[PDB]
Amino acid sequence: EYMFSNKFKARVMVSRKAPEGVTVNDHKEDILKYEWFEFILPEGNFSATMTIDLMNNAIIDNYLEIGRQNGVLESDIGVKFDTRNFRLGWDPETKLIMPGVYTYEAFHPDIVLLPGCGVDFTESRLSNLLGIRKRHPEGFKIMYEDLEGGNIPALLDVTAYEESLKIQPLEKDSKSRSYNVLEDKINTAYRSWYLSYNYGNPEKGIRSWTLLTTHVFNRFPENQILIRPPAPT
Amino acid sequence: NEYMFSNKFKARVMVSRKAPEGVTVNDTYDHKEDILKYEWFEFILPEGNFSATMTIDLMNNAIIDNYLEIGRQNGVLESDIGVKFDTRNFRLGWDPETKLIMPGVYTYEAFHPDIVLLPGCGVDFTESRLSNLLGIRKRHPEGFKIMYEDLEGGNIPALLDVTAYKIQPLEKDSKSRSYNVLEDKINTAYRSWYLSYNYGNPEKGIRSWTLLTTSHVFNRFPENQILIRPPAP
Amino acid sequence: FSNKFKARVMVSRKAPENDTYDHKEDILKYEWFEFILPEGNFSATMTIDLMNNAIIDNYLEIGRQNGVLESDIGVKFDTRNFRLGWDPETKLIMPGVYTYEAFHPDIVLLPGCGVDFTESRLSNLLGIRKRHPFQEGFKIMYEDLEGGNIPALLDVTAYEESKLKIQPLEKDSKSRSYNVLEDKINTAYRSWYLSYNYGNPEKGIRSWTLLTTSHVFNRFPENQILIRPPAPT
Amino acid sequence: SNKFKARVMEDILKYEWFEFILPEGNFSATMTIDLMNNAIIDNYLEIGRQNGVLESDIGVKFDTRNFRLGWDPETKLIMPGVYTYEAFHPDIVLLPGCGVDFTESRLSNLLGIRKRHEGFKIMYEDLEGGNIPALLDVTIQPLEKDSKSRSYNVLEDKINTAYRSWYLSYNYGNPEKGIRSWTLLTTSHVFNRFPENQILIRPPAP
Amino acid sequence: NEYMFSNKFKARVMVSRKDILKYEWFEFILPEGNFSATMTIDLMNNAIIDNYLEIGRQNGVLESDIGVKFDTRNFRLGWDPETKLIMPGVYTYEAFHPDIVLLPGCGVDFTESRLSNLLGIRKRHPFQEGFKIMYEDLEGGNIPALLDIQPLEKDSKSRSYNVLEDKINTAYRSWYLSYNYGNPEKGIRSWTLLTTSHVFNRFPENQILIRPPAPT
Ligand SMILES: [Zn+2]
């Protein structure tokens, strides 16, 4: 009867420590622990942008009670709801985002994930408001492993290319938050459902079983991944 | 009657605030011993078809006009008004460790019309249709009075003293108006219907018998974060 | 001609028939005219600008050349709720200016003036109607708006430097008389909206009228009564 | 096809009729008015300007203002010195010898100007009583020229202007002898080449 | 069919520049979604440029020789019948109707595409089973050159505007100009119909390649 309506579940990072014996040296922390939680939003009829802001606020509210106090970093959040088309300013030769910033235009609500994380909309109605549905329907869980081909490309170090030409990716933000650039030095550890749906394998990736359909809310103004998503105009 | 005035509501507010009829009041007399007297009134708004924001403005202006007539001349402070209609989701920027609103100000975004109350106060919508315009209805319908004791778990958290960030709450606004911080110095005496509905006990709080649905003279306290003019949707 | 209204306005201000003469004995004459607006399908707020322009066009044609002042216009259509900002103890508009928010189209009148909507459809567009079809004809005169006197504004420059000199403002910036009366709280201006809402509910203008839903246009930007009415939204 | 026909042009004055063509599309009233003025000016820049006609004798303009708004009954002029820049209804402004013809056009029905009936031709002689009052030189005499020395076409008596407008003759002309007897008012920078001329300024948008 | 990309089109652009120039057809695919005409035009231009950044650019083709641009402006608005140039010096920045701008050797094909309906460009006759719009079909739709009495031959960043002989018109042709100003019974108007409908601004100084204006 009188239960909660705007709700979803997700798997986030809870702990980030060293091996049981290791002690801080002169990395950061190697052992990572993840756990499922149920996130509850305040009731009401919200738009997609307002729902996305509240969903991100629930993820960060979890990070502030169990995690920040257990060693996890802001660069390890691992679940974010966005609206951008990453890799928009992508260059085929340098394989980096040349403008140095992801295009700040709203295209379609999105799910950005880090390794070991995911979301589950089996008992939720927010997937429909976000226009992300199951193509053929029991169970709706989108994990990091299901988003093959949807890796977010790394941004160019524009401060560096303008020191001469040195093309290199940007490894940290203004406040020294890791952008999670990988060994290939072209891609980022973040994966997004929108990139895997449009740029992944059309008959084997996330598109084969999903369907695209029709300030406290900006705690990381410097981080290009955690920035507040743009609103549709 | 065709002259019923239509836009009206009843509420209980503070009338007096007089130190006990006694002997002395040194510079070390606890003003928690101040005797507080309350009374019921019927408030009438001008006739017209107003939006929810304009209705909230006129409902708040009716509360203040009563304070200017009776309470102001009987020792009641502007920090003891006791009935305010808002649209914000207080405790948005709340931190589970410090237990304070870290931005120092409540998030100035409109979510849903809200009723904020101080101890001894309340509103009554038994003979009024303004609650339907405010999207606050009875779940199981004879009588609709929402009092301070009915908003358990909806206490508004205290704001962080950002000019001194130490980790203490702000206890006065810029014009030296008491924010009504309590013992433990994390929460405030103000309770809100929206908080008790969403963050209170689901089966014992205000949510069990009220329902959330869809529906400068107006800024006399620009300095005070509690009595500030509500944001517009 | 579709849009047209009738109104009684002042036509002459002259002595009965030395700087010792008191101009409270000036002979004042009023006359009925029919004011016609350009044709079209206008909004209420655009209609109000045209109806006031018709009043001024008559003042420039006869009244101005016959000794009447801009303080004696006597018919103005507004949208404000005057006496918002009224204080129950000082009985003045403490902000020193009337609230510039549109509430409902209003009729403001001076002694001896009035408006007649017997052969006019503008009263329906302005949301002002007769409550019963007992007698044909629709005329609202200054004598019917008892209890709808517009309170006077506070002399803020005297109240602010006193620190208390709580006295009404008796003239505007360009030295236009606000027509303040004895007791120095109220004004000779009356409004239908104030008498409708704040007058006697069973004997005032409410008993036979009904409220329903709805720079040449700013020739007196300094005068708080003749200022261009605010637009909705 | 969105088209219409109109008549357009130191001492002698020539006049000639033409057919003006608009680019195809479904446009609003403001964009339609801008295209029709550009079609008039485009005709002046080819046949006319090179033949001794001045920018003070264009003769056809589509506006939205209510000229004579700031009119004073004593001076018989527009005291603000500028016409009120508010949109009231799309209008047709004409000079002597000019006119517009909507006999094959559907653009008048979009501008809310229809015949109560045929054929629909509106000439300067049909707008009797719709003369635009002259502005006031603010320094009691009418302003005779614009900032760039463009004649406002002031007439004798120094109160009225040679420009006539359909809206003024419809609302302030004779109700049973003017343009109102057979027309009806209904509901609906390349486009600003004369910023100084109060008559030729880009019409305001609703 | 179910997983087929919906927002796609085919076009012929420049691939090699070494002068003899070579062109080839490609199929451009847009991200899925229901986008407006304004937002779709930005994605179609990004697909053309993304192809230039891959095939081309490495082979000597210039940003002057891009050759497929989707616009919304009415070029030749500020055109003068005597000087035959755009006297304001810039094309009018008002949105009229989505448009196709082409250079010699280029073209677009909407035979297997639903984007022509969203761009308000339809076939006037179901007689035709294909819908290809080439540079040779836009006769009379040359975009006039800008003034400064001489035409502007390069952009602000030294990009050739591709001004031609006679120094009045440009090598760029547009469907909207050929539709409204070309031969009514011989140009593109005879078999097409006009109907109702930063990474997106990589050439801010180029008047031809500037981001198209948005309606209203
Ligand atoms: Zn009755």
Numbering used by the authors:
A (entry chain B): 13 to 38, 42 to 152, 155 to 181, 195 to 244, 283 to 301
B (entry chain E): 12 to 152, 155 to 178, 196 to 245, 283 to 300
C (entry chain A): 16 to 32, 37 to 182, 195 to 245, 283 to 301
D (entry chain D): 17 to 25, 44 to 151, 155 to 176, 197 to 245, 283 to 300
E (entry chain C): 12 to 29, 45 to 174, 197 to 245, 283 to 301
Quote the paper.
In the ADDomer, the PBP monomers spontaneously assembles to form a pentamer, and twelve pentamers organize into a dodecamer characterized by high stability and thermotolerance exceeding 50°C.16–18 The PBP monomer folds into two distinctive domains; the jelly-roll fold domain which is located in the core of the dodecamer and assumed to be responsible for multimerization, and a solvent-facing exterior domain, called the crown domain. The crown domain comprises two highly flexible regions, called variable loop (VL) and arginine-glycine-aspartic acid (RGD) motif-containing loop.
ADDobody with minimized VL and RGD loop sizes (ADDobodyXtal) was crystallized. Crystals grew under two different conditions, one containing 0.1 M zinc acetate and the other devoid of zinc. In this zinc-containing crystal form, ADDobodies also adopted a pentamer; however, the pentameric rings are not stacked on top of each other. Rather, a zinc ion mediates the interaction between pentamer rings participating in crystal packing. The RGD loop region clearly lacked density for about 12−15 residues in all chains of both refined structures indicating conformational disorder. Moreover, the structures imply that multimerization on the level of the pentamer in the ADDomer nanoparticle may not be mediated by the jelly-roll fold domains alone, but that the crown domains also contribute, given that the ADDobodies were found to form pentameric rings in both crystal forms, in spite of being monomeric in solution.
